[PDB]
Amino acid sequence: FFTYETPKVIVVKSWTIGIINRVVQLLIISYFVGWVFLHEKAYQVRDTAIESSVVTKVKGSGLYANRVMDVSDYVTPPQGTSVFVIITKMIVTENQMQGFCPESEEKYRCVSDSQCGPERLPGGGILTGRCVNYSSVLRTCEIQGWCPTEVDTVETPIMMEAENFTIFIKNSIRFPLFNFEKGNLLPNLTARDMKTCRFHPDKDPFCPILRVGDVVKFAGQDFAKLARTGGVLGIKIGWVCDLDKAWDQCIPKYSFTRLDSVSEKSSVSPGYNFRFAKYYKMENGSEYRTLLKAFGIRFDVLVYGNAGKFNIIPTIISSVAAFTSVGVGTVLCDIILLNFLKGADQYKAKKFEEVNE
Amino acid sequence: FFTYETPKVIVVKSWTIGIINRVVQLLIISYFVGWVFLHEKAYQVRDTAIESSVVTKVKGSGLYANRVMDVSDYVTPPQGTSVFVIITKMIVTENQMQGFCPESEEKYRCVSDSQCGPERLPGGGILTGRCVNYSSVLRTCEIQGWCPTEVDTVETPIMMEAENFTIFIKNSIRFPLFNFEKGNLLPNLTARDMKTCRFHPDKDPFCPILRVGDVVKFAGQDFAKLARTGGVLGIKIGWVCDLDKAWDQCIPKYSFTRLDSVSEKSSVSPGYNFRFAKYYKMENGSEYRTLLKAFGIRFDVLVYGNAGKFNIIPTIISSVAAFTSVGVGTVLCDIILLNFLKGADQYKAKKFEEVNE
Amino acid sequence: FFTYETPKVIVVKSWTIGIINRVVQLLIISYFVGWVFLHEKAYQVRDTAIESSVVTKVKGSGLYANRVMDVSDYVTPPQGTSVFVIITKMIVTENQMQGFCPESEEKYRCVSDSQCGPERLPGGGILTGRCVNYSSVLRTCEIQGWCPTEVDTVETPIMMEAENFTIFIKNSIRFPLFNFEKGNLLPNLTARDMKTCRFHPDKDPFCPILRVGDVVKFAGQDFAKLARTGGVLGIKIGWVCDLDKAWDQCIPKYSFTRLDSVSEKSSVSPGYNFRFAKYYKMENGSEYRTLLKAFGIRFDVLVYGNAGKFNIIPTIISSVAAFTSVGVGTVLCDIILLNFLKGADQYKAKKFEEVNE
Ligand SMILES: Nc1ncnc2c1ncn2[C@@H]1O[C@H](COP(=O)(O)OP(=O)(O)OP(=O)(O)O)[C@@H](O)[C@H]1O
Ligand SMILES: Nc1ncnc2c1ncn2[C@@H]1O[C@H](COP(=O)(O)OP(=O)(O)OP(=O)(O)O)[C@@H](O)[C@H]1O
Ligand SMILES: Nc1ncnc2c1ncn2[C@@H]1O[C@H](COP(=O)(O)OP(=O)(O)OP(=O)(O)O)[C@@H](O)[C@H]1O
Ligand SMILES: OC[C@H]1O[C@H](O[C@H]2[C@H](O)[C@@H](O)[C@@H](O)O[C@@H]2CO)[C@H](O)[C@@H](O)[C@@H]1O
Ligand SMILES: OC[C@H]1O[C@H](O[C@H]2[C@H](O)[C@@H](O)[C@@H](O)O[C@@H]2CO)[C@H](O)[C@@H](O)[C@@H]1O
Ligand SMILES: OC[C@H]1O[C@H](O[C@H]2[C@H](O)[C@@H](O)[C@@H](O)O[C@@H]2CO)[C@H](O)[C@@H](O)[C@@H]1O
Ligand SMILES: OC[C@H]1O[C@H](O[C@H]2[C@H](O)[C@@H](O)[C@@H](O)O[C@@H]2CO)[C@H](O)[C@@H](O)[C@@H]1O
Ligand SMILES: OC[C@H]1O[C@H](O[C@H]2[C@H](O)[C@@H](O)[C@@H](O)O[C@@H]2CO)[C@H](O)[C@@H](O)[C@@H]1O
Ligand SMILES: OC[C@H]1O[C@H](O[C@H]2[C@H](O)[C@@H](O)[C@@H](O)O[C@@H]2CO)[C@H](O)[C@@H](O)[C@@H]1O
Ligand SMILES: *[C@@H]1O[C@H](CO)[C@@H](O)[C@H](O)[C@H]1NC(C)=O
Ligand SMILES: *[C@@H]1O[C@H](CO)[C@@H](O)[C@H](O)[C@H]1NC(C)=O
Ligand SMILES: *[C@@H]1O[C@H](CO)[C@@H](O)[C@H](O)[C@H]1NC(C)=O
Ligand SMILES: *[C@@H]1O[C@H](CO)[C@@H](O)[C@H](O)[C@H]1NC(C)=O
Ligand SMILES: *[C@@H]1O[C@H](CO)[C@@H](O)[C@H](O)[C@H]1NC(C)=O
Ligand SMILES: *[C@@H]1O[C@H](CO)[C@@H](O)[C@H](O)[C@H]1NC(C)=O
Ligand SMILES: *[C@@H]1O[C@H](CO)[C@@H](O)[C@H](O)[C@H]1NC(C)=O
Ligand SMILES: *[C@@H]1O[C@H](CO)[C@@H](O)[C@H](O)[C@H]1NC(C)=O
Ligand SMILES: [Ca+2]
Ligand SMILES: [Ca+2]
Ligand SMILES: [Ca+2]
């Protein structure tokens, strides 16, 4: 039987419960309108799956170890991806060749060939088992491998000029949910600007050229100390864009931070370095290498975003949930009505028809 | 007191509101079955935390600068991860040595040693302060650094053979939520296939070997132009899997796009190039290097996914939300019934027991 | 008119339906406290958008090709990022020069110059078009390019010592929504610890030093085979932290996996290798190179996390959803009461005030 049910309903008309209920309903409606609808923008579809493309190029020349270093010297790796290192300090061990020689760390002091056993395996090469004089004052165990051993201990200068190097970032982003593409280079960017522009969060925040020194500052770091220990900075690019607004309002927000934080909270491992070697060999077959311990700033360009564009389906479901939520005030209004007019017995009786068996 | 409450209810039996309510219920149920259940597949749990692995290897040989280039010559970096560059064009500066020489861009034209001060510090090397004859017609400032300076400007040919190179991808994906692992190399991949296979959207869509020219075509690019300016292409690998279906129906979908989008939309920064150097030294200790300004196509293999497998809890909560939603027709049924039969007063009186105090 | 509506309600008092409904309500409340509140911890805000930075440094020395290899030889690339390779096996093709020579894979068998045409376009250098003796028994096609050609096929040893190398990880993580930073190096780590500590999932899970052999074991991989074939293992670092709990309880979880899973289930692509060359050139201008086909284990240090901390708004809306959901038992209690008490007619009559017209 095609029959429509609906509840029998009391309809109190107290001025008190009337105004207090209407106020609770106003609060529910205004909360839903201002927060869930305007602020949390539930009337639109969101895309968080952003597609990004980063190309980098470092520029500047510097003095180090009586050489002029350009980008090809101090940038590692070279292909201009979203992570690169600018080397600020180098510990060179020139012309290592495969052979025999003693370690240089005091960690390996010896007087007898018997002390040189399978105890201290890492580092350099493999122990020959002998104990040999490294200097007039010290004897250490002898090893086979790249000779001479590097000294990890005496401090070298840092490349101050690196502070005035420039990082050019070229970022392309695409929101597929809205098939919307844009990049951090606006069409009114000129060659002349590129030649002279200066990124600053306030003074010029759209300039693709970033002074290393500026970035180090924005992250609150002392170039002098960071360049000595090495470390990692993040240049974050955020694209939070409401596509319901104007196309030219989808704009890049740059942020600057140091990522290897644990390092400062550590006296044991204070920075970021790595070791690699330049490989040569003579007209004789013999090979030799230049070993560099490289200290520098790693830069991660970090691109995130999320975009919203209005759609009818989310709006519809949000308004339906809104209407279904206007009802929830009834329980509080029940409590007020049934316990705050002295004649509560009247209302409990009016509303509740007891039964028993 | 162990008491069960339930409201007093009108139970109208008008044929009109009866059938209109039953039809509204049929529509709510059919939306929930067709949309929320079949389409949006709400009966299963979804996992997007996919685990992926990309291993790459390039093949091909070409003529450039009267040499045969193999992969080790044109692929950078070499380790065959999900991002790599295939170099298509090169502007070379042979045998740079550390020294003194004049700059070569007209950007540094001078007549006086006084123009060459500490003002235009980046690029090439460091100004020595003199102004030097660069050619019989031109004077530019002298610098200390890698000499001679690179000439940026004469356009060089591209490596046409690069079009016919092959990119081999090896992708492993794993869904931890369902402990389901699979890769883009289907168990029916044979050696003979590998020897001749052919990625093609139609003819061989599971061939792990992709022609560069193909991929460039697929991104809607002209190899000539891309090989001239450089760029970044994305090879996307999708694992959209309905695990309720067959294990052998979990299949990879290849899709092709150019990620450095801003570049064609820009007159200032039109492609992708980078600079790196081959470091040598004479039998004498003397160092010399080959400076390469490298133009090429960047490929990043992009693996995303989501799989769903049925679970009981999503079905339970969706059916619970269904029943809690079946009522929602009542507000519309109320307005129609309670305001469109002229004798609406009957229903108001039967339903509404007014009160006053 | 500020008027409050509310439904009229039956109020059964049967002991039976009283306890059965009260039990259903107890079960809903206990589930909501135990599941949605204790387990799924809905009283707190979650952030998964963790920012992470990894720096690695590999250590150990080993014998390969009758040389001692240190980190600068076998780790690639060298900058100490979240992905690196420890090379375990090498197939070297020494002193290659650009020239003419026949191929060395049997894939290029020939007897006549007519077989070597533009027919088999890929691979090696360019076919010179002639057919030349490769061996006393076999003839292959001649190519222009780096000579002699590499033979991929003769089996070489592995660097057994690689098993005993050590990977040092330094991970910095940041939950930005709660602006909480920490690292995997706890402040009570000493130099002495670093010198001798030993990572173990149970005994010392905070030692940042992981023996490669251990990592290979933990991923359920056999060093000998992984080192022969090459492969990819994942080192995942998880930060599951309840900030409501103790601060020194935000702790990293190590997990070990092989990511290139497709490799073992496949007869086509069994490991991980790549090729690169050491570049030299004579005192004559002419270049010659050492070609290495490099086999090793790739390492991805994989950092995920999510933190939850109590907030009032999630607690409020969960308690609200709890109370609004407690009602749902009424439908089942209706069916039970109105059809399983013999006096169902009493309640049908009490509750339902029919209408007809
Ligand atoms: N770090 C940087 N500092 C200043 N300008 C830069 C930097 N990187 C790139 N540019 C400039 O931005 C413009 C576009 O960069 P791009 O490298 O794509 O062009 P290019 O002609 O290859 O550059 P270049 O010839 O200067 O190496 C160029 O004019 C270049 O001079
Ligand atoms: N793979 C490893 N195995 C054991 N200890 C290591 C390893 N890597 C680093 N350490 C220890 O932790 C310390 C911090 O390393 P970091 O690279 O930050 O600086 P470093 O002193 O130049 O390293 P090293 O002296 O090993 O070259 C190191 O000095 C070293 O003693
Ligand atoms: N870019 C490519 N084009 C064509 N074939 C490829 C390519 N990459 C790999 N292959 C083939 O796929 C197989 C899997 O590659 P894998 O590197 O695992 O083996 P491999 O022995 O090192 O290959 P090869 O030595 O022949 O390059 C190889 O036998 C190789 O022939
Ligand atoms: O998911 C958490 C929630 O946080 C933010 O909301 C804040 C709000 O910004 C503040 O004004 C504060 O007073 O109230 C909220 C605390 O929960 C975001 O605005 C919101 O989008 C985000 O979801
Ligand atoms: O592109 C025009 C655009 O108009 C509408 O945009 C509105 C939007 O609804 C509001 O949120 C506001 O912030 O911006 C506009 C009104 O000033 C719609 O987004 C859409 O129909 C259309 O694309
Ligand atoms: O809630 C957003 C919604 O977006 C998409 O829904 C599509 C639907 O799939 C199309 O068939 C179209 O006709 O209607 C909607 C308009 O976007 C997603 O399919 C879905 O996952 C998501 O719920
Ligand atoms: O193939 C065995 C498989 O059977 C079941 O899968 C069903 C699935 O649940 C249904 O949605 C239906 O549409 O397709 C499948 C039948 O092919 C279960 O998943 C399980 O028993 C098992 O995995
Ligand atoms: O169902 C997805 C679910 O997985 C986990 O929940 C578990 C729960 O932890 C166990 O106690 C079990 O008995 O019930 C569920 C079945 O897996 C996750 O904890 C949870 O986040 C997720 O929703
Ligand atoms: O200690 C400050 C911290 O207190 C709160 O954490 C509580 C938590 O809610 C309780 O469940 C209890 O078990 O642990 C803590 C009490 O010591 C909040 O997390 C937060 O307001 C505050 O930071
Ligand atoms: C940066 O350049 C300015 C002007 O060329 C100079 O005064 C300053 O010393 C430079 N910074 C460093 C760290 O050398
Ligand atoms: C280019 O136009 C945009 C659009 O509003 C504007 O923000 C910007 O200032 C313009 N470019 C420059 C260099 O001022
Ligand atoms: C190779 O010749 C050089 C001299 O140019 C010499 O230093 C080196 O010791 C020779 N190699 C061997 C193994 O003797
Ligand atoms: C690419 O290969 C096709 C056939 O495989 C050939 O016709 C074409 O000439 C090749 N392109 C180049 C630049 O060699
Ligand atoms: C391999 O299997 C896929 C589906 O799993 C099928 O489409 C394809 O035809 C198969 N290839 C061969 C050579 O049978
Ligand atoms: C690795 O070290 C262990 C114990 O220190 C030793 O037993 C084993 O022989 C070593 N293996 C190699 C290849 O050096
Ligand atoms: C350092 O503290 C952590 C946690 O507070 C603890 O697990 C570890 O045992 C401590 N270190 C030592 C050397 O005991
Ligand atoms: C360069 O010199 C080497 C020997 O030093 C010789 O083998 C080679 O053929 C020469 N080539 C040219 C082009 O001079
Ligand atoms: Ca040391
Ligand atoms: Ca230029
Ligand atoms: Ca081969």
Residue numbers in the entry:
A (entry chain C), B (entry chain A), C (entry chain B): 7 to 363
Question: Which of the paper's sentences describe this entry?
Answer:
P2X3 receptors are a family of trimeric cation channels that are activated by extracellular ATP. Although free-ATP is an agonist in laboratory conditions, P2X3 receptors are activated primarily by Ca2+-ATP and Mg2+-ATP under physiological conditions because ATP released from cells at micromolar concentrations would largely be in complex with Ca2+ and Mg2+, both of which are present in millimolar concentrations in extracellular physiological solutions.
Considering that the crystallization conditions included either 50 mM Mg-acetate or 50 mM Ca-acetate with no other divalent cations, and that the electron densities are surrounded by acidic residues, we interpreted the densities as Mg2+ and Ca2+ ions, respectively. A survey of the Protein Data Bank (PDB) reveals that the geometry of the Mg2+-ATP and Ca2+-ATP complexes observed in our structures is highly unusual. By contrast, the presence of 1 mM Mg2+ slowed deactivation by ~8-fold, while 1 mM Ca2+ slowed deactivation by ~ 4 fold, suggesting that both ions slow ATP dissociation. Although both Mg2+ and Ca2+ ions slow hP2X3 slow deactivation, the effect of Ca2+ is more modest when compared to Mg2+, suggesting that Ca2+ might compete with Mg2+ to hasten unbinding under physiological conditions. Interestingly, the influence of Ca2+ on stabilizing ATP on the receptor and slowing recovery from desensitization is less pronounced than for Mg2+, which could explain why Ca2+ can facilitate activation of P2X3 receptors in physiological solutions containing Mg2+ in response to repeated applications of ATP.
